[PDB]
Write a structure and sequence with these properties.
2 copies of one chain form a homodimer.
Chain A (H helix, E strand, L loop, with lengths): L2 H15 L17 H11 L14 H16 L10 H5 L3 H18 L6 H12 L16 H10 L15 H15 L8 H5 L5 H8 L17
Helix pairs in contact in A: 1-5, 1-10, 2-3, 7-8
Protein name (chain A): Filamin-A
Organism (chain A): Homo sapiens (Human)
Subcellular location (chain A): Cytoplasm, Cell cortex; Cytoplasm, Cytoskeleton; Perikaryon; Cell projection, Growth cone
């Protein structure tokens, strides 16, 4: 079940990298040369790098430099780093790499758009989107798939009109339906999969990554809105 | 372990879709409207579609039409379809969807560049590694030794000491070989180190990955050592 956080963090990375025709396949290895780490940072910040880097990182000494300029750009952008050095990324320390990406997710996806920590800001935003439901956390409250259907219909009434009378004992079916409509007609990509979000062992961080896409979603023209 | 084939087939799809700034996340659902299926076919064939499709597939009747034009283009391109209809893709039949993608992998990745396409790829690897007895696309690759041999065969210097690698460290060997192949040969990891060494890996997933080797190009800055 610890795969879920890695999978969600990778999908989030690829969703930004695809705008520059680039892609990673393995968070452990594909950021080590620093090339695709810089690319990710440049597209997220909409800014170029402050100094030049090695185009051909032959030896790890050049890989350390490429990650250094990435960490410098991150530091001069007021983004707080929770003890991650260049060596950790180059040598492929998976635990600290996942920590680096989450820092990026918190800063760019959660706190940059919408007195209080970014976590309770997102919870606060969902809270009044769903006033009839008692939402407190980013895990168990979403396991049935009912709350996803409620959220998707809240953003555009008609996508999931009968969310209330959904079978709570069919979690994957409910989640897949809600996230399908959200992807097709709100443009919210599945950085987390239906099977993963309902899984009894989901981490809050993975679910937060997915839900952070909802405040800035736009309803598409051809959407099938029914009242049922 | 049945996840491996789905994961490899999805990664293969995303490796082509990324050239048109597009991406799928779920092979079961993300091809059902037919929009990203057409996109995948257009980039693979380097040709546009023969007739126009629904930009806004509101109801499944329009989703069926979008997949129909995708299947028509596939049919008029002499690509043999092993019993897959529009309904199967739209309704999200995972088994038949994986069959549809494998058809595309066989035609575009294996048989279009370089007897059946399977033994063609096996034949190509065979003389790249004449000192090794390769027969299959599964157990022969579990140690990670053969991957290191293949990567060094394509560019002598990337994995010079593959011969004296510890066979009891499969994931470590596989990760090293596939790392060098990605960085300096431009072969993306459509399959991950942990998946290729897995005792229950299917031949189809491994074939998908290895089909990228015949057309690989050595990058200028590669660290080639003799050891």
């Amino acid at each position: 079940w610890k795969k879920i956080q890695q999978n969600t963090f990778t999908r989030w990375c690829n969703e930004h990298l695809k705008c520059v025709s680039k892609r990673i396949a393995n968070l452990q290895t594909d950021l080590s040369d620093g090339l695709r780490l810089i690319a990710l940072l440049e597209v997220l910040s909409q800014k170029k790098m402050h100094r030049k880097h090695n185009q051909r990182p032959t030896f790890r000494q050049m890989q350390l430099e490429n990650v250094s300029v990435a960490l410098e750009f991150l530091d001069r952008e007021s983004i707080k780093l929770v003890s991650i050095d260049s060596k950790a990324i180059v040598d492929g320390n998976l635990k600290l790499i996942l920590g680096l990406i989450w820092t990026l997710i918190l800063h760019y996806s959660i706190s940059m758009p919408m007195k209080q920590t970014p976590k309770q800001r997102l919870l606060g935003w969902i809270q009044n989107k769903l006033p009839q439901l008692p939402i407190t956390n980013f895990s168990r409250d979403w396991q049935s798939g009912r709350a996803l259907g409620a959220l998707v219909d809240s953003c555009a009434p008609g996508l999931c009109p009968d969310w209330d009378s959904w079978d709570a004992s069919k979690p994957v079916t409910n989640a897949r339906e809600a996230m399908q409509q959200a992807d097709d007609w709100l443009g919210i990509p599945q950085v987390i999969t239906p099977e993963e979000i309902v899984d009894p062992n989901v981490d809050e961080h993975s679910v937060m990554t997915y839900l952070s896409q909802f405040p800035k979603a736009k309803l598409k023209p051809g959407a099938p809105l029914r009242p049922k």
